[PDB]
């Protein structure tokens, strides 16, 4: 699901410039179990690739 987020809402979050809030949400979700540190890194890297494009 997290990956799907950056596959659909990554551009919208980047335009809104809420990438830090998205990372904070990922951290909270990981603290609530589900996802993982590797998942957080993968999602952030996918988000970064959107900005570079």
């Amino acid at each position: 699901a997290c990956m799907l987020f950056v596959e659909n809402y990554g551009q919208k979050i980047i335009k809104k410039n809420l990438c830090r809030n998205f990372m904070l949400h990922l951290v909270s979700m990981h603290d609530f179990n589900l996802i993982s540190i590797m998942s957080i890194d993968k999602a952030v890297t996918k988000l970064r690739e959107m900005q570079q494009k």
């Binding site: 990372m23 904070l24 951290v27 990981h30 603290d31 540190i37 890194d41 952030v44």
Partner: protein, 38 residues
């Protein structure tokens, strides 16, 4: 006691400090990925 090298003078925004605190609570002592995310 160790790491006698003086720290580089780089300033941190309040958002940077708070998010560093959160990421330290998450990743603990893995400063590499913590810095990569910041």
């Amino acid at each position: 006691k160790p790491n006698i090298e003086p720290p580089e003078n780089v300033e941190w925004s309040g958002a940077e400090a708070s998010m560093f605190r959160v990421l330290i609570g998450t990743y603990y002592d893995n400063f590499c990925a913590i810095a990569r995310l910041i």
